[PDB]
Paper text:
The trimeric spike protein is a major membrane surface glycoprotein of SARS-CoV-2 that mediates the binding to the host receptor ACE2 and subsequent viral entry into cells. The matured spike protein contains two subunits: an ACE2-binding S1 subunit and a membrane-fusion S2 subunit. Extensive structures of the spike trimer reveal the open and closed conformations for the three RBDs within the spike trimer, where the open “up” RBD conformation is prerequisite for ACE2 binding. Upon ACE2 binding, the spike trimer undergoes conformational changes to expose the FP motif of the S2 subunit to initiate membrane fusion that allows the release of the viral genome into host cells.
To our surprise, we found that mouse ACE2 bound to both Omicron BA.1 and BA.2 spike trimer with high affinity, but no binding to WT spike trimer. Moreover, mouse ACE2 binds to the Omicron BA.2 spike trimer with approximately threefold increased affinity (KD = 2.9 ± 0.2 nM) over the Omicron BA.1 spike trimer (KD = 9.1 ± 7.1 nM). To reveal the molecular basis for the high affinity binding of the Omicron BA.2 and BA.1 spike trimer to mouse ACE2, we determined their complex structures. Two major states were observed for both BA.2-mACE2 and BA.1-mACE2 complexes, in which the spike trimer binds to one or two mACE2. In the first state, one RBD is in the open up position with mACE2 binding, and the other two RBDs are in the close down conformation without mACE2 binding. We observed similar RBD-RBD interactions in all mACE2 complexes with the spike trimer of BA.1 and BA.2, which is consistent with the similar interaction in Omicron spike trimer-hACE2 complexes.
Residue numbers in the entry:
A (entry chain A): 981 to 1127
B (entry chain C): 737 to 828, 854 to 1078
C (entry chain B): 737 to 785
D (entry chain A): 298 to 620, 640 to 676, 690 to 736
E (entry chain C): 27 to 70, 80 to 142, 157 to 176, 187 to 210, 215 to 297
Amino acid sequence: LSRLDPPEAEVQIDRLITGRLQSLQTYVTQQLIRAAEIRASANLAATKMSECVLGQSKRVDFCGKGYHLMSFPQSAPHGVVFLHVTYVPAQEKNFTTAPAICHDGKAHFPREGVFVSNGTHWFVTQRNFYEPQIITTDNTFVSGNCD
Amino acid sequence: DCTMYICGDSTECSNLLLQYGSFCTQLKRALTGIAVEQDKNTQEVFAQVKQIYKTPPIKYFGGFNFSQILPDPSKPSKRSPIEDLLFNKVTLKFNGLTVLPPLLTDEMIAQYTSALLAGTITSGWTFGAGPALQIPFPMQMAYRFNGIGVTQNVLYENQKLIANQFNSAIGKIQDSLSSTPSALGKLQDVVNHNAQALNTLVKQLSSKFGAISSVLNDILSRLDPPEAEVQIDRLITGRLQSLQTYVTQQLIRAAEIRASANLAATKMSECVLGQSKRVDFCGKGYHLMSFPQSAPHGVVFLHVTYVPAQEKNFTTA
Amino acid sequence: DCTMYICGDSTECSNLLLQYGSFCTQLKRALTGIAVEQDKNTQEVFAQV
Amino acid sequence: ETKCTLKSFTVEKGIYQTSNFRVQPTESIVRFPNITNLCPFDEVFNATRFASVYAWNRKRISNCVADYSVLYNFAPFFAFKCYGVSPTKLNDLCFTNVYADSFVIRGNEVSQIAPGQTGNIADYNYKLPDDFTGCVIAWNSNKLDSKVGGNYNYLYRLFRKSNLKPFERDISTEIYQAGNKPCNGVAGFNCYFPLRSYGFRPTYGVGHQPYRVVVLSFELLHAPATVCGPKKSTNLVKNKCVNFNFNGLTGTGVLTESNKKFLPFQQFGRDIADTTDAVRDPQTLEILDITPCSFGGVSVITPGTNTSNQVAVLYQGVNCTEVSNVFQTRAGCLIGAEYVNNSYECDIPIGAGICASYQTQSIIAYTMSLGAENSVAYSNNSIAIPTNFTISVTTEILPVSMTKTSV
Amino acid sequence: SYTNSFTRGVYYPDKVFRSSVLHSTQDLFLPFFSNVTWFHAIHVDNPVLPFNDGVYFASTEKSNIIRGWIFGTTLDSKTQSLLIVNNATNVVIKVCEFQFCNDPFLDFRVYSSANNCTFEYVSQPFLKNLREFVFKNIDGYFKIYSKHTPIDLPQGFSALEPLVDLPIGINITRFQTLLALHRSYLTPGDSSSGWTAGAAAYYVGYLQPRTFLLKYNENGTITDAVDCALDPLS
Ligand SMILES: *[C@@H]1O[C@H](CO)[C@@H](O)[C@H](O)[C@H]1NC(C)=O
Ligand SMILES: *[C@@H]1O[C@H](CO)[C@@H](O)[C@H](O)[C@H]1NC(C)=O
Ligand SMILES: *[C@@H]1O[C@H](CO)[C@@H](O)[C@H](O)[C@H]1NC(C)=O
Ligand SMILES: *[C@@H]1O[C@H](CO)[C@@H](O)[C@H](O)[C@H]1NC(C)=O
Ligand SMILES: *[C@@H]1O[C@H](CO)[C@@H](O)[C@H](O)[C@H]1NC(C)=O
Ligand SMILES: *[C@@H]1O[C@H](CO)[C@@H](O)[C@H](O)[C@H]1NC(C)=O
Ligand SMILES: *[C@@H]1O[C@H](CO)[C@@H](O)[C@H](O)[C@H]1NC(C)=O
Ligand SMILES: *[C@@H]1O[C@H](CO)[C@@H](O)[C@H](O)[C@H]1NC(C)=O
Ligand SMILES: *[C@@H]1O[C@H](CO)[C@@H](O)[C@H](O)[C@H]1NC(C)=O
């Protein structure tokens, strides 16, 4: 506006405006795409907050890798960190397993857990912790014969 | 590469394109970000297991038959007949447009799929929540039936019928997938869209963009430098816009593929690595187990569903 | 419609737009894809039964 | 180069793309069709008998390649004067028509054949236009057009009512009515014959001997040009990307033999992407396919200046047979690293299942390991029951909001 | 008369090779299934036909019935007109500004009284004996497409090859066909002729600017062609 005359600088100003508008439309598009990405991430984070912190979920790896127990949130200038408490089994041992037990001509199945055997012995245990208990009628039910 | 896409073998064209700014500096950066994101999406669904598991040599799990999902030692490529059928059905040098192959090839994804299959068949769900625990397959089926409310007696008694039904379903699913040619549509549409976008971006070089000709040499060998610097600018702006819109389409499709891959990884973790109580998240009906299968650009989940039938009327109180 | 939105009732304008390449083709293809997607999204929630 | 691309001084560990590798062509070839239709310049300059000055012999030249060099096969001519054009660059242009006007004149009248000049020849016999863009050649012909007795066959007009127009011919033999006396076809007082004869004899000096003058005038009307200069030619190149200029089709690439049988009316072929893929040779009937030579992208796999400075180069999507341990992969070809046979944990991704790292020494390259190996014994009468528990903590970081900005 | 041209009137739009691909181009073609004029009963009452956008000359002549062609603007004095005369083993193509009579004829080359020549383009001669020609003039280049195929227009497909192209541009608005007879009728300005000979029929069809989709096979020849304002499927 100080070197060239008005009627010949109008085209230059128009080209500059076109360039600066084309460089800004792309920025707005990138901002929209990143805003949609952040919206999806925030929806996922809110879902995890509701299903992990405000209660216990039965999902596998939605509230941590393993068996989820609880979750603690922590803030961050642009996000949230979830600390998931996971119960992991360890120190497993080999045992003999059987579907049912046939006694008195009737095939009895365990209510909760399975029958474990360590050699000429049979007990009932759960599926997450080894607790040998005698095979009684409380933890077993008859459902026919072993035919 | 904007130095070659917009300017075909010209130094003054590159000098004028460098004057436009750093459009290429962010375009090639967004493209590399898309590439890294696509290479990472292949590790959140197939690379969930830490240790590779193998199948026992004795192929007798209790009455079931998994010959169609386990890798076949006859074929050199370690894949299953279902993976071979899915691989033989997905139909797959320029002016600066290159294609980079993915990190995980079709063999490593196959090994991850085989490891996940071994973990979900031999160990059940303990391979995805800690140390692997050995357990017979019929007892795993009894666990999965008791998890939804059905007693274990119907499985321990009618085991042969369930095994025969599972074998019939595994044998019929191949014919069902081979009957409809549009079964592998979600994996072919993305490849078709990518091919069409690439072909269009290459073909749009022949467009005049308002100039006399599309090739810079013809412009610069038929006019004068002061009269052949605005005709080159038209082509430069046209190709820059055609590349910017292409980068925008690639970003949108990459976001869509990222969402799809996140959903697929969630389904892999909640259906293959354990049993879920969701209604139609691991198949339509009562979910029991899920088997993954690789594909050059995706994953196919085979969900085993137990459905009641032959109901009868009774009085309730 | 590219022919009417940009080149309304002008044959010369349509001939000038024709040399711009397949921008209009890809635009209408994306619009048809959006339409098909919007018509399909109404069948994954209400047409489950 | 990586520091210049990233605009920093302490680069991190990873692979970074900086520039692209391009093979520059060594030579440049240009092949145009044969030169067949040589315009009849020999029959104009080396004719058997030239015409008079007033009846200057005019010949039209069109639809033929004009070789402006055959004009200098003999060379004593003193007047090779070109007006409006340069005698050297005559082969760098094309015109629609070439008019050749030949005539014999005296030696002192050679300078009169020029735009603007006047006299006794270029006033009533053969006048040149003012804006004449052409070439006037003139050479002595004493040995051919001089008789001892006298060569009185060449005539010239001396008297006329008014001057002529540019490129005008007058062949009238009417008596010049000089005075008011009406001439009755007889010669005498105030009634002179306009056409006189030349007394060409070998005994003349250097100013009155017969001189043959040809005038080549170029016409460049809006009609398409059919008279172009002689096109040059070169040799062919094999297994090397050079610059080809086949009959207007210009490009850069390797011209390799193939079996793409073309049709007799077509010269080149375009692929599905409208890119030129094959082109005929303008000299021999043989199809040549155009192929891009070594082209791709260079990437520096640097472990970061924090550890060391030894970097490795990677050419992506291009074989490294043409233009530090060279190793060919499925995702490209890397130099500066040695291919290790033991699979470790992937650190720097490369592609196709190959990753680089620092062994500690030099950059390595190994097939990435998918994990450990553990095969449990599957038995229908054995189970693994846990005994102990472990309470672990897992971190999961997720962004929520963004930076609110406005322009 | 008036007949229909089902699937004929196609040619190569440009001198480029293509292999097993589809190419859509907006060129000047003859619309498929159109109303073309079949003048079989006009044995030289033969007015000259216009030359707006080119002509499609189809000939099923027995043997050497067509002797040449004339393409003028007004066929008057000082009017550039391109004449082509096909002899036994040579062809003569010239552009003459001379006036022509109503029906020029060859009997041995007396067509008209006036004579004035500007350019000449002699070359190789052009001519179950179907002979198709497509004559057009764009960008000052008079192009001809020739094809000689065995067999009325059948339901087959045959492309036209750009044999000859002349760098000359005239406002061609006339069209004259040249027959042959043995009655020995001299033409010092004659306006009528006629002789019992074989079947003589010259098809005339005007071209139109349309978009055509051509399929090129592995050999690079046109086998399938689709118009774009004929049927909804097209
Ligand atoms: C169970 O026995 C197998 C085979 O001997 C062995 O590999 C495995 O480690 C054993 N499990 C435990 C928990 O010791
Ligand atoms: C198996 O475990 C029970 C539980 O303590 C024990 O009483 C029994 O002796 C064990 N069996 C053998 C063979 O040691
Ligand atoms: C599984 O099925 C395949 C093909 O039907 C058969 O070849 C194989 O023997 C079967 N395996 C078992 C254990 O039944
Ligand atoms: C139960 O009774 C209703 C009413 O008659 C009938 O429609 C229905 O089919 C019956 N259910 C079965 C399983 O037969
Ligand atoms: C050009 O001339 C050379 C040498 O006479 C010959 O080998 C070649 O075939 C000619 N080219 C054509 C197209 O006739
Ligand atoms: C460099 O290494 C030191 C030592 O481990 C570390 O403290 C520092 O954060 C590293 N810096 C970068 C940029 O990696
Ligand atoms: C590179 O060239 C070598 C030598 O011919 C060949 O063995 C190898 O397969 C080539 N690699 C690629 C990716 O083309
Ligand atoms: C062609 O035109 C003539 C005269 O205009 C008419 O009689 C004839 O029906 C037309 N044929 C077709 C197929 O339109
Ligand atoms: C007439 O035909 C003869 C026979 O080939 C040929 O030699 C001659 O050049 C032709 N003349 C004209 C004027 O076409």
